[PDB]
């Protein structure tokens, strides 16, 4: 009832690219090892963290993301040798059960937070999931695991869920899914640079559609690297008071690792102290209850130290000029739709 | 009365993404250089009947394959790339290029079975031959060849007969018909003791169950063979066999990687010997055939040898009467076989000068 | 013998084979030793022209200079079963093993027999080939990296500054990888790229080395295949010399894969005998003729008969105007190049004193 | 009743479809877990073991290091082949590890009377492979392991009886010089032209374990239930009853079985649970028995589960291969004679 869950499994190992290559691919199954054996190290997992058993997801459970073609296209890739849905989305004949263990791990874990059976927990899977959308994997990403646990999560009971996306890329995937849809608040904080970092989607004035306005938050940086005051002045200013206003029911952590520092795609300055800081900030607005689901993040020494740090917040254990800039310019576009963003603007204003 | 070509450009789109340190053989230059050749000569467009290209329906394709083989196939077209295997690739553009292959092979086979054409030539790829039951290889994704025998036999065809001079053995097609007598599968192939790819068919692999005796193989031991040893092969083996079978309906998997210049097959058969070999099995069935494009990778050599045939479909120095020592033994050793499936063949076999 | 070219050779590297029956045959095969051997027999030149070398294969101690204790043991251990295969392309046979290892010693000693001066220069012709072998992996067809084994026998044997030119048709992800945060090491790379279209998709213009590497990692990555002669010629007038004078190396080995040559199946490209004798004279000028050249890629026994021989006649003292696409080649390395190598501003200036 | 399995030893596949697809597949391993599912047990009645991987100095007690390196390198390569018919990917080395480590679990267990018996559903087999080659679709010998584990555990005398429809060339190789295993070999056999063409009637041990190899080579193919259960009352359970072991292991395959591409034989579920039956008399149904093959998805799917349930509760030409033994055994074995005399 009070217990931090990590969900793993040791088959989303199996998902990897199908021979060595002149340039290796990031998305690997060494991520989960490393944080396996540093979370067993720190004795964090197994040990103070309970264990969830892992369940394949339904086709059913998918399909309230994702179409049924995209949900058959994935399955079928077991009997194919290897595929690429993109240049760099690859898939082997372990692929689509890792990818069915993923969302199936997030699935429960979101399930048993929201109804209680558990305090909070840290989904450690693999594939990612932010890039895929409605119909299209993409970016390393097969199915859309953050928004699976929303959906499972609004099933179970939950009328608002928040997803914070603190991966260095822009989850074009998540967005595309709740961009007319306004019972899910999505915030993606994450490098821009004009439109020309990947996936080169989340403009700060891509506020959500058709009834959906205001409840897409794009909290763009305009260059690397970006550290812990910018992220920290970020969620003071823009995350805290908009997700305060919008009163979630459950709270889920898109949780990519690419902007810690030494990662080589995301190329920013984040520290353990940064994402413990950003998991402890968010734990204020439902009382430490919520579901921690990892992305990217490709360095095996900075994932592993983040998301240690990550998992002892769960267990109860000034800005730069580029930073202002973002800020400052999200404000604009969101107080047409956050009123109570004023309070931030003034003192914001006060530099 | 006129002879059809099947063709669609469409089937120019299969191509192999990956970037390889070796160029796939199996390319769209292959039909490109065909159809040049085939326009500058005039016979098509032209000369032959260019039937209207369809693709072919799964409930067709299952009559030959799994319901699950067919699914992955069509699947490819949501990937940017995938392989069967290591060398059977697919692009977006491959499933329908493979129906339309299927697709032009199952109408060709229709209209020349009930007289709508008198035969027919399907310029198509991806080949066919190495499809089996379950899976694509062998740079096939369906097989075109039964695909059009079975669509034959469903328009009341009772015996087909499939011919398959590509230099590589059809394990596909055999895997299909192995227990099947109501087909008489045929084919000539480079084999070496199995140390040919694929490695299978050697002479004694005859058939199973119902079907023992309608697998004929004819395996040749080294790899340079020429016109004489065919046109000898044909001479004693396959028109005596095909003749006691009498078929309604005949099939040509009409590689030409057997052909002078193929990387391939670096045998040595010349247009002559392809032109003669149709003529002879133009005897069976009063010059109804559909030839089916399988292997063939040199462009100069499948240009030739398809015009060639497509010119004996169209009514149009010799060839060596004595075959090689290589050959001969290969015939002697199908003879021992399939004699005692095939006992019309004791007059041949008193070929003994 | 101070004076002589030699050739390395051991006719046990023509029994790394594949074994696995497939629809098409490998292009790395012995029959590229055999045909050279031959053409150079022909032509009087080994013997007896040139000077052998004894055959020695190199020791895991030595391999270790470049890659990992494990890489070295996953190669042996291939000596112990029937066939196997590192990548979908790069096979291995009971005999592989000591076939690269051969290929590695020849390199060494053909490496420290140069450099002492003991010879005056030399060829390797040896496989497997070399360049796609990383610290940690083979690929590409090669299993050791012969030209990195030979850069770093050479610095151990004295020399400070070592130059790789790798003219192989395919970029050399291997040796750059070795060398990305080297600058003891200069690596000079020409190859068919297409924006990354071509294997191995590496080495892009732009990848110049990493750390206090930057600037030594010199790609010239052609945007389209036929290359022929004169942009080669071009190339190595604008960018490969000027860099290599002021660099001013010790030692100089030739990646000499000919699998840009004329009749190539796998490059499609278009130099000829000539072109590969010119690039060989002019890389002389650097050095007095004191080179060593290691046989890469190379697949038309034809072409490469021909471009080995005219290449080692060179050894043993024997178009101007660019394709558009190849000026636009040389015109990007030039802006990148300038960073690290400023002298190449006088090229910069030659060069457009000439048009169009 | 324990079960040995695990879903890792179904990642050992050949590398791609091919012409000809291998017989040694991880279908093998589906179709009996589904069998055995349906009928639960198994799951249900049977004890489930946790899977270890076998460790080096446990596989050095049969295995050269020259082979036990080979065999975990493979794990680096794409894939590779021992021989022409044995093949290993990447994942082949810890699938052979856990068909290892399931079989020295069970034999320490079933020795040590943690449970009565046990059934390791393994792959890759392992009879073929011998002290120094993988071979024969084997990578590591499982039956061999397991004797010498159990023998590390105090069992001084260990009866290997294997009815695989092929000679285990690799367990009669390691236990050739050894008195304190006993090998019986039940194998199609055709004067030396079935594979692996060994196993010779007169191929007893050798020097010191003379008479401790029993090999019963077949005759022809079509060999039936009739013939099998003839020779385990007249060879078989005499030859062990005089050996009275501590431990017994049955190298269980199921190529013998009906409708086999392979064997060609006509064993049916009654002839495995009765010949396993007979084989409980000793040791009062204390038994580990080890899978290695049979390739006909639902013959070895129906003689598995016909094997596992005895566990729980539950001419011509075979009789001169039978006399041919016992003229070359009796020398060994005196207590023969009375087998013998009943022939008559
Ligand atoms: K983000
Ligand atoms: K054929
Ligand atoms: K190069
Ligand atoms: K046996
Ligand atoms: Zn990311
Ligand atoms: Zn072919
Ligand atoms: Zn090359
Ligand atoms: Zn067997």
Redesign the interface.
């Known amino acids: 009832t009070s217990s931090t869950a990590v969900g793993f499994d040791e088959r989303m190992l199996?998902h990897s690219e199908f021979?060595?290559?002149?340039?290796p691919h990031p998305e690997r199954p060494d991520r989960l090892r490393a944080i396996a054996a540093s979370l067993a190290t720190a004795g964090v997992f197994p040990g103070r963290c309970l264990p969830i058993n892992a369940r394949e997801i339904t086709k059913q459970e998918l399909q309230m993301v994702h179409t049924s073609?995209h949900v058959?296209?994935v399955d079928?890739?077991s009997?194919?040798?290897?595929?690429?849905?993109?240049?760099d989305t690859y898939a082997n004949e372990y692929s689509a059960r890792a990818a069915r263990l993923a969302a199936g791990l997030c699935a429960d874990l979101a399930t048993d937070i929201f109804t209680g059976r558990v305090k909070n927990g840290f989904a450690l899977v693999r594939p990612p999931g932010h890039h895929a959308g409605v119909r299209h994997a993409m970016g390393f990403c097969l199915h859309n695991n953050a928004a699976v646990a929303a959906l499972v999560a609004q099933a179970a009971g939950a009328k608002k869920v928040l997803i914070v996306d603190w991966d260095v890329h822009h989850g074009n995937g998540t967005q595309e899914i709740f961009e007319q849809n306004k019972s899910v608040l999505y915030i993606s904080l994450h490098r821009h640079e004009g439109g020309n970092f990947y996936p080169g989607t989340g403009a700060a004035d891509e506020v959500g559609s058709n009834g959906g306005e205001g409840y897409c938050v794009n909290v763009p940086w305009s260059c690397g690297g970006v550290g812990d005051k910018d992220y920290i002045f970020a969620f003071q200013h823009v995350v805290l008071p908009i997700a305060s206003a919008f009163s979630p029911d459950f709270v889920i952590i898109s949780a990519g690792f690419d902007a810690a520092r030494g990662d080589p795609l995301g190329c920013c300055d984040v520290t353990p102290a940064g994402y413990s800081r950003m998991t402890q900030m968010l734990g204020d607005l439902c009382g430490g209850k919520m579901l921690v689901i990892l992305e990217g993040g490709y360095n095996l020494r900075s994932i592993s130290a983040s998301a240690t740090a990550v998992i002892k917040v769960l267990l109860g254990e000034t800005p730069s000029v580029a930073g202002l800039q973002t800020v400052l310019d999200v404000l604009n576009i969101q107080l047409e739709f956050w009123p109570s963003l004023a309070i931030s603007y003034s003192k914001l204003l006060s530099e």
């Open positions: 199996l021979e060595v290559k002149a340039q073609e058959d296209a079928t890739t009997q194919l040798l290897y595929s690429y849905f993109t240049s």
